[PDB]
Amino acid sequence: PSGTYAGLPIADYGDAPPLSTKTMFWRTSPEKLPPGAWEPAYLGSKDERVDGPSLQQVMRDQLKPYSEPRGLLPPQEILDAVCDAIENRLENTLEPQKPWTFKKACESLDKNTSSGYPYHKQKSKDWTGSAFIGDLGDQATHANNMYEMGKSMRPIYTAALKDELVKPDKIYGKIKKRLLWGSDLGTMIRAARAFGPFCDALKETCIFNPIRVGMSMNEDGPFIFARHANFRYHMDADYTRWDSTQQRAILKRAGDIMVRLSPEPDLARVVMDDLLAPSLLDVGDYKIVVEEGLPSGCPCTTQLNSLAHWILTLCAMVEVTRVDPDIVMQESEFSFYGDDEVVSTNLELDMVKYTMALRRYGLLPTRADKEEGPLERRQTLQGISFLRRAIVGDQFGWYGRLDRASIDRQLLWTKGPNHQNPFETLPGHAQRPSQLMALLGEAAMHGEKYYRTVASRVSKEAAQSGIEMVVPRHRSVLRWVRFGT
Amino acid sequence: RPSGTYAGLPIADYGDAPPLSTKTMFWRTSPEKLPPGAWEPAYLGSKDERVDGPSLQQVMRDQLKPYSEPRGLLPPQEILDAVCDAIENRLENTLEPQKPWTFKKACESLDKNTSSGYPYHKQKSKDWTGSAFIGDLGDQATHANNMYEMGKSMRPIYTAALKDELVKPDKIYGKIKKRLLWGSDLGTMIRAARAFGPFCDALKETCIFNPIRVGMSMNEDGPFIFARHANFRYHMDADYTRWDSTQQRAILKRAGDIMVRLSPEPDLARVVMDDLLAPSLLDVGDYKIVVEEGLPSGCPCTTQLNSLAHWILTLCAMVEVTRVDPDIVMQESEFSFYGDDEVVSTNLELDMVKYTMALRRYGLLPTRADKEEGPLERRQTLQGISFLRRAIVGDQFGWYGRLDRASIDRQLLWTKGPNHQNPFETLPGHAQRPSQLMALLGEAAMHGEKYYRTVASRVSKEAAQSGIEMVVPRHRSVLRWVRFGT
Amino acid sequence: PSGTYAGLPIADYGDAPPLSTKTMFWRTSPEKLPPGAWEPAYLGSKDERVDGPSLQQVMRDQLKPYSEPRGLLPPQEILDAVCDAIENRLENTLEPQKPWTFKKACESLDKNTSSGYPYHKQKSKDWTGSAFIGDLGDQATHANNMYEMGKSMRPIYTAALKDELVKPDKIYGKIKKRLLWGSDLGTMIRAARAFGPFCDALKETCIFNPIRVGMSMNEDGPFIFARHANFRYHMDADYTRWDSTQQRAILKRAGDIMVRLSPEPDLARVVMDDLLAPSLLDVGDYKIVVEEGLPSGCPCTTQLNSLAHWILTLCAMVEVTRVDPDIVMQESEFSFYGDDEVVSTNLELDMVKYTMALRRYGLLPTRADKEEGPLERRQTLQGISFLRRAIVGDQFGWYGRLDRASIDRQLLWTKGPNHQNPFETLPGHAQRPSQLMALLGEAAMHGEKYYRTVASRVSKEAAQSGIEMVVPRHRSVLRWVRFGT
């Protein structure tokens, strides 16, 4: 077969199961949902709420970017300098690790999610609680032999559509649903082993270096935010379709680093060379080839993507200021989490030329709160968000706070088993407490008035659920929330 | 679909059940002759080299007669209402509110050596990792769990069996009788165990102060329990024939009503409880039949729910006859239930003629113990009544339960081992009977020196040819160990 | 079907999957292997070191001697004399065991190794760190019942060819490759239950009783060899094709002893009687019938085999010396591990008559470690070997030292995943901390000079390497190996 499907080559028939039609989200009251209330994404024909296109269609629209012409590399000379700085920096900061055994590679894998090609099994189905058996034991078995023999395996990605809460517009307007990349089990265990050591280190380092993954918001926010705060100029950028705009060239460079700084370089070189080679994506009707943009199924995926964000940010910064990348790194503080950034700096940076330099790499930043570039840069770290918490400073120090609407949305809905109609209500949801408490916390940070507003809504539910809830005093949470513990 | 009848009951579908077992677990302990009138394992079907008899399938038909017999009468509505509230209060006051059971804890609570039942009919340990169910029993449970959380309903499929146990020779050589077993679907097994395990646990904890003794130790809780009965003048053991099959779903619901209301998840437990009591589906080889009535004895909860009904049926009779409100009867009586097994102790001056009627009128079948005839007798001693198949005995040291010598003797003549076709076949040394062997001494020593010494005869020999050897204890020495423990 | 495979009757169709065309060995340097260097054994039609006969054919070659006319029985009057003596000695040494549970037996098994007939799954594929489930589970259950019930089962042995390093000739001359019998899990656990107590007894008296199975060369060596040194004359006796040349009649004699010292003898009788009954072997296309020779699959067999050995040897000595076997055995110290023997004795033994006896039994000693015989004996314990170690006569006592040439190899080759070409290099190995150490300590005992040339090789084998380890001093490590712990 061959084969132009959604702008991209065809290679084979798809072994993809048909796109999930049911959602995990459940309204907690039966009340008339407030106007403009976020909602579970489009569900398909079956979705009673609206009459939108096929899920198969929605997926096509999502593939569009991955065939849009790639932008230009950063000037080769500068790129070399940044890769090497980022490397050199890590070399000095990252602690050499023990290699990961098949056991720990398999131990690490989320057993609640799908094995993907070809068994498309929920991983738990084949897990002893130590190693993998049966169908998946054997895929893993072989994926391990192959990794140890430094031999190559084409990975097969299975596409999906993220079930999440979205603005009503995404539903009753132009229907949009966000694309996923379900890795296969073989590939997962291979990259697990390959770059699980390196990733680990990076998480232990997540306060000292700019890749933030593994960072505790409450526990690390104050310090990380105080750090950015030492710097004169702050900025946000709001990349849209970051993932599908990545150049594989750059990804190779991030991979170059990851390999170098992983304990089995010889064997990593393969998995990474594998992970980056024109990628096969099963959309159901066909598997297709995607040569560009980020291939996002793998354990290490988000770190490698962060690593590119770093590279890309520096590349422009250095071009613009024209200062040696390591210098900029000592006149700057960075936070990265995939597409998620906060760039702080003492260097006088030209916001026009910076915007121009990235849009030239093919990126699509925007003005974080007014949707327009050049990217403004304020004298105040307050008003940028990171991890959808907003940066805030009082007389005690800095902290990331979740905003009103998000905490509103978290009360209105709750996880549950899969179902087709999201306004349905399950019985007395028992995993409420441990979360419901945190909600209590995060609202304290908005003070008294609002906290009362939540204090009640909390009482309302939790009573008619498990046992009773202690509703602590506003000032008593603030201390548990800000300080501790 | 079908319908149709088998064993006088509508046919709902074809049977997936495997064929009924033709073997037993009881290997004669020794190669000698069996003493005359000796108990022997129940009939093995076609292939029993002991007697010519019908197909096991036939024995099943016999066993299935009662579930199509007309039900007895509901106890006067008012008293029913009255007794259920009184029983609900007792439990409301006596049960430490337990918290909801998770998937994991329910899965953990299952006896993994019994069958999984329909569909796969597999020994449960087979898809068991040590904590979860994988593969086949994985799918069925994980599906069964989802249906629960969501409050959707399932149709339980039960699988029939015939109890393999020692029976009085007469049930083999005269008219053949082997007892009906129900076996729940792992689907229901897990579902009904979330809904009702917290309750069964609660009840379990509360069993020295509550008449439902499911979970008791005869050694530890026996003395207390029995000494508790003796505070009451009159005693009756008033024992039932065909208990399970006489049950009225109507009452069984009231039983269920209570457990649901008393569960950490009423909303969820209700959907599961309705499912159990719904006209039941029993896989009997060739067909699955609709059983509208009696008790659906598959699931975990079952035996608690069963006793709960027995509570409700005894109370109704007492209130119907004495005409004292159910809280006063219960403050004037000590009850002991376990499914069908029962002691009833009360100071109230109950009319035994009038009582039996009410019971029979509810369609129950009480007989004068294994002494034959009445009206049921009442006595002013507790001595002689028995419970969980031990004799209730009282001495200078308090009350206790004493498995009787006839009963001890058989245990000497039979030992459990793998399934096989000939009951008179003997094993080797069988190197795992020290646990069992010890108990026998204990049991014996409570019958005075004469006896224990002649049980010291046998427990000696059968210790020679065995895995290890220890010396036989002194009487007074072991009796103490037996009476006050440990 | 019917009815002749390499000289032996057909009984049924085989179910054995095909033979491994692959090796587990991998080269450590790409450097061209020295002249006359051992290599993994031949791997058939896809093997590239030569074009030779089918593995099928090679195995037929291995099966030839099972059909050979058996040798003769020792004189009845000498046979019982010994056997009754051996048992009485065990009886005077062995601490009585308590019966092995299913639970215990299921634990014993080498979990990393094929299930045999009929699933042919590696055991690990079905275990829970706990018990066998699924397939093997059921198999394990059934057999256990047939045990307790004292009913019988027909073992179904699977045939294979040992992947090992061999003298290069055995690839480029007359291709040979050693036969293995895979037992079936049923017989496995069944024999484990029946005969595990006995083997355990043997384990814990392997210094006082000639059957050294389970011994530690390092911990137990210095005192086993010390007992040997207490005697005037010592002898290699080196046997060709032990297992093939065996006589079931004697295997039954050792069977009888074993069964006599088992906690549950009646249960054990059966298992033995099966083990010893004409063995059914699964050779791929067909199952055939092996009436003679030692059937080697299950647990037990190695102790069974040594026990036979014990008998055969003790026979020759009584045969020749004319002396009551109690006196022989009290003017002598034996060491048997399978076919590996060492016989120390004070009795003047007529070497001509003695050898003759063994051959008459249908045995096949070669010359100690030279060519042609009459077998020969020395006045010194040095020069003899056992468990592939040269016995050494040191001021600190006696020991086992792995020879120079054996070391060179363990440095030349590394075990890895199964592959097609033995000559490839295992891309930047990890697992050597334990194995590297041991060989560094092996070389310790060969003097200060030899240790140096080794140290260096160890180190460039620690070049592209998982752990950046020290070379400890010679003196230090030599202290470490000899003395322990």
Swiss-Prot record, chains A, C:
It catalyses: RNA(n) + a ribonucleoside 5'-triphosphate = RNA(n+1) + diphosphate. Inhibited by Suramin, Suramin-related compounds and NF023. Inhibited by PPNDS. It is found in: Host cytoplasm, Host perinuclear region. Residues 232-353 form the RdRp catalytic domain. It comes from the Viruses. Its cofactor is Mg(2+); Mn(2+). Disulfide bonds join C298-C300. Mg(2+) binds at D236, D238, D340, E341, S385. Homohexamer; also forms fibrous hexameric oligomer. Interacts with the viral genome-linked protein; this interaction induces the multimerization of the RdRp and enhances its activity. Replicates genomic and antigenomic RNA by recognizing replications specific signals. Also transcribes a subgenomic mRNA by initiating RNA synthesis internally on antigenomic RNA. This sgRNA codes for structural proteins. Catalyzes the covalent attachment VPg with viral RNAs. This is RNA-directed RNA polymerase. It comes from Norovirus (isolate Mouse/NoV/United States/MNV1/2002/GV).
